[PDB]
Amino acid sequence: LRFRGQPGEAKDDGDELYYQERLKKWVKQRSCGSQRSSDLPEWRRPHPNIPDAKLNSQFKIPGEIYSLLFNYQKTCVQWLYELYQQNCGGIIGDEMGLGKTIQVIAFIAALHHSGLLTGPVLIVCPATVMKQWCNEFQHWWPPLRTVILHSMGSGMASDQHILITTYVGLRIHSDKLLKVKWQYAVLDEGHKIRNPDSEISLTCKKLKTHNRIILSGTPIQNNLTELWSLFDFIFPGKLGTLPVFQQQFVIPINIGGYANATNIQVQTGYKCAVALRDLISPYLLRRVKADVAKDLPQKKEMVLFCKLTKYQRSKYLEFLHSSDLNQIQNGKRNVLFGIDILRKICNHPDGDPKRSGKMQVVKQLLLLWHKQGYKALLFTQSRQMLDILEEFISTKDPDLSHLNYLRMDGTTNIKGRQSLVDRFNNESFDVFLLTTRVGGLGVNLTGANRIIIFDPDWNPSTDMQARERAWRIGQKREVSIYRLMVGGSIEEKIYHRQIFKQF
Amino acid sequence: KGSRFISTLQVKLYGREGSSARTIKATLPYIKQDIPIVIIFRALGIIPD
Amino acid sequence: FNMKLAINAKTITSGLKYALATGNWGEQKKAMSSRAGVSQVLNRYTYSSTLSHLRRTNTPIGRDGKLAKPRQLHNTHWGLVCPAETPEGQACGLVKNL
DNA sequence: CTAGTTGATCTCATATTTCATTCCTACTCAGGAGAAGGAGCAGAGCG
RNA sequence: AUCGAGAGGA
DNA sequence: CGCTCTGCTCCTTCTCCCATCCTCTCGATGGCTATGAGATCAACTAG
């Protein structure tokens, strides 16, 4: 169905058939010259990469990549090498920013030469992340035939060694490409899947092969709540799967683990979690910054205690008194909106900042730092709020946007996004409003000196991710985190709820 | 007594003495069958005719 | 203790209110023992228009398509209700007046 | 003619769990009339 | 608005 | 004359339907999730 009708669809049929067969647009843009089997005769002359692992006695990983690996990565890759030789999975729990992609590649270098793994290898990560990785696979080890599985018709058409693709691509066509002669498979950050009830989790399970490995920036200390679903892939024949765990460990964990108000203790639930957790010793790999983070400041944090005004206090209570949410019934639109509304009494209200204690706290802190000359981040998880905060600092109090304010929208591509990061870190800009998700992207704003959280996420360990970007190694000034919490409001209820996750 | 019930017992006189009126049966609380009064008398602790 | 009592207070106050307001004395969920024949509002056009409400009595119904035996004047009605004061039509004997 | 860039629209992951249960009729008159369906019975031919 | 409920008129 | 079979009579249960037209008043109640972010596709535009 297209406005142009069948005449337009005939054109679509042209390209459609071409995607399945050979599309000249695709041939010119992402095939001819891109390390294809007909190109590799030219590319492998620069990179014949003779595997030291097979060539030289007593070697496990080839020097071409091994010498690019850091001493700790060298160690971890050798550990992974052995996991493959043991026919088992594992968790590459190396801390964020240390690098794991090259470790996978170093491992692969050895696989198809010392391991004789001449067949297909599956690697999955985000599309822009793959733009980078595609070049890395191509320039690091082309002896393994490069196949990039981007799209359905054309991607699937390349049914041949190393397979490069994405999570979007998995939803585009992984139901067709199942068990495609995979000799080794690895997924990037395991928490790109994380959700136990997702279709991604089901997809991850579907991706079955000889040896299944997942990379991650997290540990197994107490993240089992979601690791149970990652175990489906990583340890299908070592620990079991999520639905097993749902009855095996989850039942006693849920019964006692939340400080049960009757007769069951947390320790019992914990002990069950321990029984599973501590099985993953020889399969857990972890590089730590204890021997890397040699030049950075103290990771400081605190919580602000903002009180409600007569106006605010009266209105969030009035909503609760007049809306009668429990007769509407619970989980309904206005009931659930109430959860956000009771927070919006200070985030909005619709409404000069004189009616909001939070807007007044932010005002005072930024004007202090205005004279201090400190760079600062604002932290907010909402576009409606991103613009409301901008209206606060531009239509209600212009001088706060006049402190060299900067912000990413997301519609801007990576070229512009990178310049936004650079703009804040360099003297050009002093204030930037940041969201956890762009913290995930790579917005490493270490130039910041002070950070105000206007409206955080509902999980301290995700707030952490944004903070880690702000605290990247190489930073030369101390940065304190200021959580703007409003006393008596639902923000404290939210505060304690997200603590319960961290707890 | 906070109930009232306004319930009822039925006494059935079965037509005519030529056949069916031979007996009288009563509809009793939660009972599936109508029961002859002589059975009821036994239940009442009453034996002698 | 003092929380469940608040629930009850609302429930009683508004529940009793509501039931009479709708004129149904059951669960209010569907055909729950309607008492629409009982609940109504004061007819205010004159003095006797209110006296009408005093004397009018809501009799039980014989559904539609039924009148005489009941409705038909019985001589035990003598002296208790006024046989002249009966509304005509569907209400013919439905409403009695003392 | 075509490559670049940027707006539009559709579809998606990662935190609250939250919380119990809802409850019985008390039962009142409620009908008319005629079809449809089963159940038992009685007698006729058969063994 | 959409039902429901109740009264009056022919 | 019993066996059997069948047709005959009775009983029991089920199912659907309440004139036409008009006028006013009351009223209750509805009316219940997300969330922007990301990515890819189309459209315009300039070299």
PDB file of N, CA and C in Angstrom, chain A residues 144-225:
ATOM      1  N   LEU A 144      39.226 -14.361   8.287  1.00  0.00           N
ATOM      2  CA  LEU A 144      37.914 -14.963   8.496  1.00  0.00           C
ATOM      3  C   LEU A 144      36.965 -14.164   7.586  1.00  0.00           C
ATOM      4  N   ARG A 145      36.372 -14.827   6.587  1.00  0.00           N
ATOM      5  CA  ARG A 145      35.575 -14.138   5.556  1.00  0.00           C
ATOM      6  C   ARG A 145      34.516 -13.209   6.128  1.00  0.00           C
ATOM      7  N   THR A 146      34.648 -11.920   5.821  1.00  0.00           N
ATOM      8  CA  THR A 146      33.741 -10.915   6.358  1.00  0.00           C
ATOM      9  C   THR A 146      32.376 -10.891   5.703  1.00  0.00           C
ATOM     10  N   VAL A 147      31.360 -11.150   6.513  1.00  0.00           N
ATOM     11  CA  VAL A 147      29.972 -11.068   6.099  1.00  0.00           C
ATOM     12  C   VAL A 147      29.199 -10.153   7.028  1.00  0.00           C
ATOM     13  N   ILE A 148      28.611  -9.099   6.490  1.00  0.00           N
ATOM     14  CA  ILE A 148      27.869  -8.200   7.351  1.00  0.00           C
ATOM     15  C   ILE A 148      26.377  -8.341   7.106  1.00  0.00           C
ATOM     16  N   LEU A 149      25.687  -8.881   8.106  1.00  0.00           N
ATOM     17  CA  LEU A 149      24.262  -9.168   8.002  1.00  0.00           C
ATOM     18  C   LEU A 149      23.392  -7.966   8.385  1.00  0.00           C
ATOM     19  N   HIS A 150      23.409  -6.962   7.519  1.00  0.00           N
ATOM     20  CA  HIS A 150      22.585  -5.771   7.673  1.00  0.00           C
ATOM     21  C   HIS A 150      21.517  -5.785   6.593  1.00  0.00           C
ATOM     22  N   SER A 151      20.279  -6.025   7.032  1.00  0.00           N
ATOM     23  CA  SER A 151      19.046  -6.150   6.231  1.00  0.00           C
ATOM     24  C   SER A 151      18.636  -7.607   6.156  1.00  0.00           C
ATOM     25  N   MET A 152      17.479  -7.847   5.554  1.00  0.00           N
ATOM     26  CA  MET A 152      16.934  -9.187   5.440  1.00  0.00           C
ATOM     27  C   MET A 152      17.311  -9.815   4.115  1.00  0.00           C
ATOM     28  N   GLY A 153      16.698  -9.370   3.025  1.00  0.00           N
ATOM     29  CA  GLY A 153      16.988  -9.935   1.707  1.00  0.00           C
ATOM     30  C   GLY A 153      18.488 -10.015   1.419  1.00  0.00           C
ATOM     31  N   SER A 154      19.147  -8.856   1.412  1.00  0.00           N
ATOM     32  CA  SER A 154      20.575  -8.779   1.108  1.00  0.00           C
ATOM     33  C   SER A 154      21.467  -9.358   2.202  1.00  0.00           C
ATOM     34  N   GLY A 155      21.134  -9.108   3.472  1.00  0.00           N
ATOM     35  CA  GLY A 155      21.921  -9.675   4.566  1.00  0.00           C
ATOM     36  C   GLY A 155      21.896 -11.206   4.542  1.00  0.00           C
ATOM     37  N   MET A 156      20.700 -11.787   4.454  1.00  0.00           N
ATOM     38  CA  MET A 156      20.537 -13.237   4.423  1.00  0.00           C
ATOM     39  C   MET A 156      21.196 -13.859   3.197  1.00  0.00           C
ATOM     40  N   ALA A 157      21.168 -13.140   2.063  1.00  0.00           N
ATOM     41  CA  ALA A 157      21.765 -13.613   0.815  1.00  0.00           C
ATOM     42  C   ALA A 157      23.230 -13.984   0.988  1.00  0.00           C
ATOM     43  N   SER A 158      23.924 -13.354   1.935  1.00  0.00           N
ATOM     44  CA  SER A 158      25.325 -13.658   2.156  1.00  0.00           C
ATOM     45  C   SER A 158      25.468 -14.863   3.089  1.00  0.00           C
ATOM     46  N   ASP A 159      24.974 -16.019   2.650  1.00  0.00           N
ATOM     47  CA  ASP A 159      25.010 -17.227   3.470  1.00  0.00           C
ATOM     48  C   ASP A 159      26.341 -17.942   3.356  1.00  0.00           C
ATOM     49  N   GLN A 160      27.340 -17.388   4.040  1.00  0.00           N
ATOM     50  CA  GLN A 160      28.695 -17.919   4.035  1.00  0.00           C
ATOM     51  C   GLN A 160      29.264 -17.968   5.444  1.00  0.00           C
ATOM     52  N   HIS A 161      31.906 -16.120   6.498  1.00  0.00           N
ATOM     53  CA  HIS A 161      32.280 -16.684   7.776  1.00  0.00           C
ATOM     54  C   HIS A 161      31.768 -15.793   8.916  1.00  0.00           C
ATOM     55  N   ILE A 162      32.602 -14.880   9.407  1.00  0.00           N
ATOM     56  CA  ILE A 162      32.169 -14.016  10.489  1.00  0.00           C
ATOM     57  C   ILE A 162      30.958 -13.210  10.064  1.00  0.00           C
ATOM     58  N   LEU A 163      29.944 -13.233  10.916  1.00  0.00           N
ATOM     59  CA  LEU A 163      28.646 -12.600  10.709  1.00  0.00           C
ATOM     60  C   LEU A 163      28.436 -11.394  11.634  1.00  0.00           C
ATOM     61  N   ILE A 164      28.343 -10.217  11.040  1.00  0.00           N
ATOM     62  CA  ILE A 164      28.155  -8.988  11.795  1.00  0.00           C
ATOM     63  C   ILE A 164      26.714  -8.498  11.730  1.00  0.00           C
ATOM     64  N   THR A 165      26.045  -8.325  12.876  1.00  0.00           N
ATOM     65  CA  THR A 165      24.675  -7.823  12.767  1.00  0.00           C
ATOM     66  C   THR A 165      24.216  -7.043  14.001  1.00  0.00           C
ATOM     67  N   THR A 166      22.923  -6.710  14.035  1.00  0.00           N
ATOM     68  CA  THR A 166      22.381  -5.889  15.107  1.00  0.00           C
ATOM     69  C   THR A 166      21.146  -6.481  15.752  1.00  0.00           C
ATOM     70  N   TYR A 167      20.738  -5.891  16.878  1.00  0.00           N
ATOM     71  CA  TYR A 167      19.557  -6.328  17.615  1.00  0.00           C
ATOM     72  C   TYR A 167      18.289  -5.992  16.848  1.00  0.00           C
ATOM     73  N   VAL A 168      18.337  -4.888  16.108  1.00  0.00           N
ATOM     74  CA  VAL A 168      17.231  -4.496  15.259  1.00  0.00           C
ATOM     75  C   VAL A 168      17.121  -5.525  14.157  1.00  0.00           C
ATOM     76  N   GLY A 169      18.277  -5.882  13.582  1.00  0.00           N
ATOM     77  CA  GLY A 169      18.375  -6.897  12.547  1.00  0.00           C
ATOM     78  C   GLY A 169      17.841  -8.227  13.044  1.00  0.00           C
ATOM     79  N   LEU A 170      18.101  -8.544  14.314  1.00  0.00           N
ATOM     80  CA  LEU A 170      17.575  -9.775  14.864  1.00  0.00           C
ATOM     81  C   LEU A 170      16.046  -9.746  14.836  1.00  0.00           C
ATOM     82  N   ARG A 171      15.450  -8.591  15.127  1.00  0.00           N
ATOM     83  CA  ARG A 171      14.000  -8.515  15.036  1.00  0.00           C
ATOM     84  C   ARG A 171      13.534  -8.470  13.577  1.00  0.00           C
ATOM     85  N   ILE A 172      14.377  -7.949  12.686  1.00  0.00           N
ATOM     86  CA  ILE A 172      14.082  -7.923  11.258  1.00  0.00           C
ATOM     87  C   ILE A 172      14.035  -9.317  10.621  1.00  0.00           C
ATOM     88  N   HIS A 173      14.846 -10.274  11.100  1.00  0.00           N
ATOM     89  CA  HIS A 173      14.871 -11.565  10.404  1.00  0.00           C
ATOM     90  C   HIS A 173      15.570 -12.761  11.092  1.00  0.00           C
ATOM     91  N   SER A 174      15.914 -12.668  12.389  1.00  0.00           N
ATOM     92  CA  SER A 174      16.564 -13.800  13.081  1.00  0.00           C
ATOM     93  C   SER A 174      15.699 -15.058  13.144  1.00  0.00           C
ATOM     94  N   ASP A 175      14.375 -14.914  13.011  1.00  0.00           N
ATOM     95  CA  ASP A 175      13.480 -16.073  12.963  1.00  0.00           C
ATOM     96  C   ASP A 175      13.714 -16.925  11.724  1.00  0.00           C
ATOM     97  N   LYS A 176      14.379 -16.361  10.719  1.00  0.00           N
ATOM     98  CA  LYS A 176      14.688 -17.100   9.522  1.00  0.00           C
ATOM     99  C   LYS A 176      16.121 -17.593   9.631  1.00  0.00           C
ATOM    100  N   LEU A 177      17.024 -16.719  10.067  1.00  0.00           N
ATOM    101  CA  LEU A 177      18.404 -17.152  10.240  1.00  0.00           C
ATOM    102  C   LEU A 177      18.652 -17.804  11.590  1.00  0.00           C
ATOM    103  N   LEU A 178      18.159 -19.028  11.745  1.00  0.00           N
ATOM    104  CA  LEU A 178      18.394 -19.793  12.962  1.00  0.00           C
ATOM    105  C   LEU A 178      19.417 -20.884  12.724  1.00  0.00           C
ATOM    106  N   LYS A 179      20.336 -21.020  13.675  1.00  0.00           N
ATOM    107  CA  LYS A 179      21.398 -22.018  13.638  1.00  0.00           C
ATOM    108  C   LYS A 179      22.144 -22.049  12.311  1.00  0.00           C
ATOM    109  N   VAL A 180      22.424 -20.874  11.744  1.00  0.00           N
ATOM    110  CA  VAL A 180      23.092 -20.740  10.444  1.00  0.00           C
ATOM    111  C   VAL A 180      24.563 -21.124  10.449  1.00  0.00           C
ATOM    112  N   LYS A 181      24.832 -22.404  10.681  1.00  0.00           N
ATOM    113  CA  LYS A 181      26.176 -22.952  10.723  1.00  0.00           C
ATOM    114  C   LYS A 181      27.084 -22.181  11.676  1.00  0.00           C
ATOM    115  N   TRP A 182      26.527 -21.741  12.798  1.00  0.00           N
ATOM    116  CA  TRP A 182      27.273 -20.958  13.765  1.00  0.00           C
ATOM    117  C   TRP A 182      28.250 -21.837  14.508  1.00  0.00           C
ATOM    118  N   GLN A 183      29.504 -21.420  14.528  1.00  0.00           N
ATOM    119  CA  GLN A 183      30.547 -22.159  15.205  1.00  0.00           C
ATOM    120  C   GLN A 183      30.907 -21.473  16.528  1.00  0.00           C
ATOM    121  N   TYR A 184      30.542 -20.199  16.625  1.00  0.00           N
ATOM    122  CA  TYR A 184      30.723 -19.396  17.827  1.00  0.00           C
ATOM    123  C   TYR A 184      29.846 -18.166  17.772  1.00  0.00           C
ATOM    124  N   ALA A 185      29.232 -17.814  18.899  1.00  0.00           N
ATOM    125  CA  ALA A 185      28.404 -16.620  18.927  1.00  0.00           C
ATOM    126  C   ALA A 185      28.610 -15.839  20.206  1.00  0.00           C
ATOM    127  N   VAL A 186      28.509 -14.527  20.074  1.00  0.00           N
ATOM    128  CA  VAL A 186      28.690 -13.628  21.187  1.00  0.00           C
ATOM    129  C   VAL A 186      27.803 -12.411  21.069  1.00  0.00           C
ATOM    130  N   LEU A 187      27.227 -12.019  22.185  1.00  0.00           N
ATOM    131  CA  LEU A 187      26.395 -10.841  22.200  1.00  0.00           C
ATOM    132  C   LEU A 187      27.137  -9.781  22.982  1.00  0.00           C
ATOM    133  N   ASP A 188      26.947  -8.516  22.619  1.00  0.00           N
ATOM    134  CA  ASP A 188      27.583  -7.435  23.357  1.00  0.00           C
ATOM    135  C   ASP A 188      26.911  -7.310  24.715  1.00  0.00           C
ATOM    136  N   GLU A 189      27.063  -6.147  25.359  1.00  0.00           N
ATOM    137  CA  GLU A 189      26.454  -5.893  26.658  1.00  0.00           C
ATOM    138  C   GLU A 189      25.150  -6.669  26.863  1.00  0.00           C
ATOM    139  N   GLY A 190      25.177  -7.568  27.848  1.00  0.00           N
ATOM    140  CA  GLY A 190      24.056  -8.439  28.164  1.00  0.00           C
ATOM    141  C   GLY A 190      22.850  -7.666  28.592  1.00  0.00           C
ATOM    142  N   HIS A 191      23.072  -6.481  29.125  1.00  0.00           N
ATOM    143  CA  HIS A 191      21.968  -5.692  29.569  1.00  0.00           C
ATOM    144  C   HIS A 191      21.314  -4.868  28.466  1.00  0.00           C
ATOM    145  N   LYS A 192      21.653  -5.167  27.199  1.00  0.00           N
ATOM    146  CA  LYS A 192      20.916  -4.647  26.056  1.00  0.00           C
ATOM    147  C   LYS A 192      19.708  -5.559  25.845  1.00  0.00           C
ATOM    148  N   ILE A 193      19.720  -6.703  26.540  1.00  0.00           N
ATOM    149  CA  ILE A 193      18.661  -7.682  26.531  1.00  0.00           C
ATOM    150  C   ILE A 193      17.888  -7.575  27.830  1.00  0.00           C
ATOM    151  N   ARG A 194      18.645  -7.683  28.939  1.00  0.00           N
ATOM    152  CA  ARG A 194      18.238  -7.658  30.367  1.00  0.00           C
ATOM    153  C   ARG A 194      16.798  -8.068  30.757  1.00  0.00           C
ATOM    154  N   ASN A 195      15.767  -7.438  30.181  1.00  0.00           N
ATOM    155  CA  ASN A 195      14.370  -7.714  30.538  1.00  0.00           C
ATOM    156  C   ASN A 195      13.966  -9.180  30.339  1.00  0.00           C
ATOM    157  N   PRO A 196      13.731  -9.931  31.435  1.00  0.00           N
ATOM    158  CA  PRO A 196      13.324 -11.336  31.510  1.00  0.00           C
ATOM    159  C   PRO A 196      12.069 -11.674  30.700  1.00  0.00           C
ATOM    160  N   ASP A 197      11.180 -10.701  30.533  1.00  0.00           N
ATOM    161  CA  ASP A 197       9.925 -10.930  29.834  1.00  0.00           C
ATOM    162  C   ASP A 197       9.933 -10.459  28.381  1.00  0.00           C
ATOM    163  N   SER A 198      11.086 -10.027  27.881  1.00  0.00           N
ATOM    164  CA  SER A 198      11.151  -9.510  26.523  1.00  0.00           C
ATOM    165  C   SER A 198      11.182 -10.572  25.430  1.00  0.00           C
ATOM    166  N   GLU A 199      10.845 -10.131  24.218  1.00  0.00           N
ATOM    167  CA  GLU A 199      10.936 -10.971  23.036  1.00  0.00           C
ATOM    168  C   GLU A 199      12.394 -11.099  22.636  1.00  0.00           C
ATOM    169  N   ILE A 200      13.222 -10.141  23.090  1.00  0.00           N
ATOM    170  CA  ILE A 200      14.657 -10.187  22.869  1.00  0.00           C
ATOM    171  C   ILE A 200      15.204 -11.366  23.633  1.00  0.00           C
ATOM    172  N   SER A 201      14.726 -11.549  24.870  1.00  0.00           N
ATOM    173  CA  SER A 201      15.137 -12.678  25.691  1.00  0.00           C
ATOM    174  C   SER A 201      14.799 -13.978  24.977  1.00  0.00           C
ATOM    175  N   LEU A 202      13.610 -14.022  24.370  1.00  0.00           N
ATOM    176  CA  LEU A 202      13.197 -15.185  23.599  1.00  0.00           C
ATOM    177  C   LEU A 202      14.085 -15.373  22.363  1.00  0.00           C
ATOM    178  N   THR A 203      14.452 -14.258  21.721  1.00  0.00           N
ATOM    179  CA  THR A 203      15.326 -14.251  20.549  1.00  0.00           C
ATOM    180  C   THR A 203      16.713 -14.751  20.911  1.00  0.00           C
ATOM    181  N   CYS A 204      17.215 -14.271  22.038  1.00  0.00           N
ATOM    182  CA  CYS A 204      18.517 -14.629  22.551  1.00  0.00           C
ATOM    183  C   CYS A 204      18.574 -16.140  22.713  1.00  0.00           C
ATOM    184  N   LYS A 205      17.544 -16.702  23.345  1.00  0.00           N
ATOM    185  CA  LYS A 205      17.415 -18.147  23.496  1.00  0.00           C
ATOM    186  C   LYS A 205      17.457 -18.858  22.134  1.00  0.00           C
ATOM    187  N   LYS A 206      16.690 -18.333  21.159  1.00  0.00           N
ATOM    188  CA  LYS A 206      16.632 -18.876  19.790  1.00  0.00           C
ATOM    189  C   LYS A 206      18.012 -18.927  19.125  1.00  0.00           C
ATOM    190  N   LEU A 207      18.874 -17.960  19.434  1.00  0.00           N
ATOM    191  CA  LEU A 207      20.220 -17.930  18.878  1.00  0.00           C
ATOM    192  C   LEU A 207      21.096 -19.017  19.500  1.00  0.00           C
ATOM    193  N   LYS A 208      20.897 -20.263  19.077  1.00  0.00           N
ATOM    194  CA  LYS A 208      21.644 -21.397  19.617  1.00  0.00           C
ATOM    195  C   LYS A 208      22.795 -21.875  18.743  1.00  0.00           C
ATOM    196  N   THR A 209      23.937 -22.111  19.390  1.00  0.00           N
ATOM    197  CA  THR A 209      25.139 -22.596  18.733  1.00  0.00           C
ATOM    198  C   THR A 209      26.031 -23.397  19.679  1.00  0.00           C
ATOM    199  N   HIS A 210      27.252 -23.677  19.226  1.00  0.00           N
ATOM    200  CA  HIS A 210      28.221 -24.479  19.969  1.00  0.00           C
ATOM    201  C   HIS A 210      28.666 -23.836  21.275  1.00  0.00           C
ATOM    202  N   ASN A 211      29.033 -22.566  21.212  1.00  0.00           N
ATOM    203  CA  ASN A 211      29.515 -21.861  22.385  1.00  0.00           C
ATOM    204  C   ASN A 211      28.931 -20.455  22.450  1.00  0.00           C
ATOM    205  N   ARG A 212      28.223 -20.177  23.547  1.00  0.00           N
ATOM    206  CA  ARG A 212      27.487 -18.930  23.712  1.00  0.00           C
ATOM    207  C   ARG A 212      28.041 -18.026  24.846  1.00  0.00           C
ATOM    208  N   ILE A 213      28.611 -16.873  24.452  1.00  0.00           N
ATOM    209  CA  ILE A 213      29.240 -15.873  25.353  1.00  0.00           C
ATOM    210  C   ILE A 213      28.565 -14.490  25.353  1.00  0.00           C
ATOM    211  N   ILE A 214      28.411 -13.867  26.523  1.00  0.00           N
ATOM    212  CA  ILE A 214      27.872 -12.496  26.538  1.00  0.00           C
ATOM    213  C   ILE A 214      28.785 -11.523  27.285  1.00  0.00           C
ATOM    214  N   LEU A 215      29.007 -10.362  26.672  1.00  0.00           N
ATOM    215  CA  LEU A 215      29.831  -9.308  27.246  1.00  0.00           C
ATOM    216  C   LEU A 215      28.985  -8.480  28.212  1.00  0.00           C
ATOM    217  N   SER A 216      29.577  -7.931  29.271  1.00  0.00           N
ATOM    218  CA  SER A 216      28.822  -7.012  30.130  1.00  0.00           C
ATOM    219  C   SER A 216      29.683  -6.149  31.028  1.00  0.00           C
ATOM    220  N   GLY A 217      29.208  -4.948  31.330  1.00  0.00           N
ATOM    221  CA  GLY A 217      29.910  -4.074  32.262  1.00  0.00           C
ATOM    222  C   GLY A 217      29.510  -4.325  33.731  1.00  0.00           C
ATOM    223  N   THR A 218      28.621  -5.302  33.973  1.00  0.00           N
ATOM    224  CA  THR A 218      28.146  -5.603  35.326  1.00  0.00           C
ATOM    225  C   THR A 218      28.740  -6.886  35.918  1.00  0.00           C
ATOM    226  N   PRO A 219      28.493  -7.107  37.216  1.00  0.00           N
ATOM    227  CA  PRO A 219      28.918  -8.279  37.982  1.00  0.00           C
ATOM    228  C   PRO A 219      27.750  -9.206  38.248  1.00  0.00           C
ATOM    229  N   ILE A 220      28.023 -10.302  38.948  1.00  0.00           N
ATOM    230  CA  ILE A 220      26.983 -11.265  39.276  1.00  0.00           C
ATOM    231  C   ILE A 220      26.671 -11.264  40.767  1.00  0.00           C
ATOM    232  N   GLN A 221      27.211 -10.283  41.488  1.00  0.00           N
ATOM    233  CA  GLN A 221      27.043 -10.144  42.935  1.00  0.00           C
ATOM    234  C   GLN A 221      25.591 -10.204  43.409  1.00  0.00           C
ATOM    235  N   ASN A 222      24.724  -9.448  42.747  1.00  0.00           N
ATOM    236  CA  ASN A 222      23.323  -9.381  43.131  1.00  0.00           C
ATOM    237  C   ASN A 222      22.434  -8.889  41.990  1.00  0.00           C
ATOM    238  N   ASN A 223      22.873  -9.124  40.755  1.00  0.00           N
ATOM    239  CA  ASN A 223      22.126  -8.719  39.570  1.00  0.00           C
ATOM    240  C   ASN A 223      21.321  -9.877  38.977  1.00  0.00           C
ATOM    241  N   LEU A 224      21.179 -10.961  39.750  1.00  0.00           N
ATOM    242  CA  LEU A 224      20.538 -12.188  39.292  1.00  0.00           C
ATOM    243  C   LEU A 224      19.122 -11.991  38.794  1.00  0.00           C
ATOM    244  N   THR A 225      18.392 -11.044  39.389  1.00  0.00           N
ATOM    245  CA  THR A 225      17.024 -10.715  38.977  1.00  0.00           C
ATOM    246  C   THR A 225      16.833 -10.719  37.455  1.00  0.00           C
TER     247      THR A 225
END
